[PDB]
Every structure is written in C-alpha cells, then in structure tokens.
Subunit: 213 residues, 2 copies
C-alpha cells in the first residue's frame, strides 16, 4: 500500500519503550520475502536510533521518549527490499510530528529587575516591565503561556501593596497613592511567573523599584 | 579616618588584576601595628574572593572583572585589628556599585512569533506584538534599550513591505493595501531587535502572519 499518514506523538511519553507507531507494508510481499528499513535524522543520522523498524514485521517503533524542544518534527524515509537485494518501492516519506507537553518551567530573563518612578505619579502609571520566557509552545497550547503575579512587597509602608502587575504583559504599575522618597526610597517586590496561564508551575524573581523625587 | 565613600566600578574591566580601589586606614595605626581585613558576600561569603584587602598596607583590591547582571552592588565590611589581636574600630561598611557596560545582546522571547489579521482591515491596524529583552540597564544607559525593525518580508506580493513595526513597542502593524488571502495566505517577516536604541548589536527572529478571510 505504501503511504503513511503523518504521525503525531506527544513528547515525554511514559514507558515502556519501544512502542509501535505504524506497521509498514508493501503489497508485493505476496511475490517474495521483504525486509523493511528506515533512514533519516532520528533513524540512521543524529540523534541516532530514536526510531527503528522491525525488518520482517515492518513495525515502525519509537525507542525513547521525544522532547519537542530539541526536535519538533522528524522526516524519515521507508525502504522495502527483497531477500535478493532489490528495492521494490520508491522510498516513502514518514513524518512524525512531536506535540507539546509542559516539561519546562518559566524562567525570568533576569534574577533582579530594576525600575524607577517619580513619587508623584498618578495611580495607574507604568513603572517597569518584567519578563519570563518559557520553552514550551505558546501558540497552540498554554504550556508556554506565562501569567504574572506579585507575591509580596517590602517594606510594607505605607500599606501592603503600592503596586500591581499586568497578568499577561508583566507591566508593573502604581496602584496606590503615597509614594515618598524621604519616607521609603526603595521597594522590593517578589515577582512570580506561572505557566499554563496561571495553572502550572511557578518561578520567582525580584523587582527593585527606586522612588525618585 | 575610618570611613569609606561608595565606590563605583564599571563591569567587565580589562586586566591587569588585581586592581586597587581604595586604601583603608585607621587613625589608631600611630599607636600599634594594624592588620586589615574584609568580610561580606564578595569577600569571605559567596561569591568568595572577588575582593581582597592587603593585610599590611590597607589596600582594598578587586581581583576579577565584575558582572552587573550577576551582582550589581556588594556590601562589605572593613576591620582593623592590633598585632596583639584586639579590634580597634567598629567594622566599616564599604559599598561597591557596579556600573553598566553593553555585554548582552537583545534576545527575542521566542524564535518564532505568530499572529493573524483579517484581509479587510484598514491600514494602521495592529497585527501582533513581538518582544525582545536586554539584560543590560535601560534606566541609566542605552545598553538595555531595544529598537525594533523589519529586515525583510516574504513573499514580496503585492509589494515589498505590507507591514511596519513600532520602533519601541514591537507592535507590528498593516501599512499598505492589497492583502488577499487567496493570493497570499501567509507572510514571513524577518524581525530585528537592536540595543543602544538602534546603534548597538542586532538579534534576529521571524514573525509569521496569517491573513484571514
Ligand atoms: Ca511551561
Ligand atoms: Ca514542551
Ligand atoms: Ca545590551
Ligand atoms: Ca551590562
Ligand atoms: Ni529542555
Ligand atoms: Ni550574562
């Protein structure tokens, strides 16, 4: 028959391996005996032997769990060969698409972000913008989508939270009145980024805000 | 004379090291032979041995190049001890301030951004935002300030550049007529982010735009 629909595999699949993906078959196996094999990156080029084929049965096998962030798509070729050594098919393209899981934590682009704002700005004024990246996919899944939060502030004067953060952009803004350099010239905000848009894992950094006159 | 003003040191200084910063001195050295030492993160707590003090002469020394993106300020303490082993001064606070150099290039938050726009929108309409960050300081210097540009667009139908990008926000916008899914369902925009507000180094990424019905 000798076509294969593109194959979709979720990354970091649980064992046991190997695991069967599809059974290769050439209809000319009624004539004589056939040996199946595969080539391409993932098969006979680096990384070597992620995939294999059982030569007699024809089972395309995956031998180890995939990681989408190393490699997202594999293009292999299928080969059928008689016992006498004749290629009985044109080599068949086999496509394997690797689909995303949340195997990565978000990671702030810096351990500390600094900012400064004039003491007399109106509530609602932007101070600075923090950023956390995430290797997982952010286009078709939430695994790469960061939500931002302020865990805590020090000191807590005048009151508990002088600031807020935009949950998607990481822009930090003044939400209350009464910033005053003489009184409190600097704040330390413990910031957090949580992937799967708020429902996943969390990473922590700090933002240090300078109050200017 | 047991006082020291804040010392500023530009990061990634060239050798040779070690480098003299300031000479510590107790006035009580006219009565006894004095030994000088330093404590604090950077001195005897991690990262250890970044700074030392010459025991006899009193010279505070920097032993290696600093990196502001690791540590921006060190708080250390100076000590003065008589040859007989007694403490002759209250320990002295010594602040080191690390000032910025442009040792980082901008990095895109991902290698590929994706967005869409309806083929009917008027020119000037926002399509998508791309983001790059720069670990270098952007409050006191231009080393962390990113300017965004569009290098090239593919394909060039109807014409060379259907899109523009806002220089500072990374918002990509439609600037020209002729979008038409049937003729061109997708554009690949090669995008660039440049530090020193356009005069420094450039990183590149790619933004793909789906034109929608
Ligand atoms: Ca993730
Ligand atoms: Ca992933
Ligand atoms: Ca830079
Ligand atoms: Ca720097
Ligand atoms: Ni990884
Ligand atoms: Ni660095």
């Amino acid at each position: 028959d000798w076509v294969v629909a593109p194959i979709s595999v979720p990354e970091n699949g649980k064992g046991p391996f190997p695991q069967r993906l599809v059974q290769l078959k050439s209809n000319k196996d009624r004539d004589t005996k056939i040996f199946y094999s595969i080539t391409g990156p993932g098969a006979d080029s680096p990384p070597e032997g992620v995939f294999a084929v059982e030569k007699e049965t024809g089972w395309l096998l995956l031998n180890k769990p995939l990681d989408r962030e190393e490699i997202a798509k594999y293009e292999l070729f299928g080969h059928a060969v008689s016992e006498n050594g004749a290629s009985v098919e044109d080599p068949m393209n086999i496509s394997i698409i690797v689909t995303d899981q949340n195997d990565h934590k978000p990671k702030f682009t810096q351990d500390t972000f600094r900012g400064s704002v004039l003491e007399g700005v109106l509530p609602g004024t932007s101070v600075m913008q923090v950023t956390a990246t995430d290797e997982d996919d952010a286009i078709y899944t939430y695994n790469g989508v960061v939500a931002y939060s302020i865990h805590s502030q020090e000191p807590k004067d005048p009151h508990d939270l002088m600031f807020t953060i935009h949950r998607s952009t990481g822009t930090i803004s003044v939400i209350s009145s009464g910033l005053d350099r003489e009184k409190v010239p600097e704040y330390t905000l413990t910031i957090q980024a949580t992937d799967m848009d708020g429902d996943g894992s969390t990473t922590t950094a700090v933002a240090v805000v300078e109050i200017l006159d």
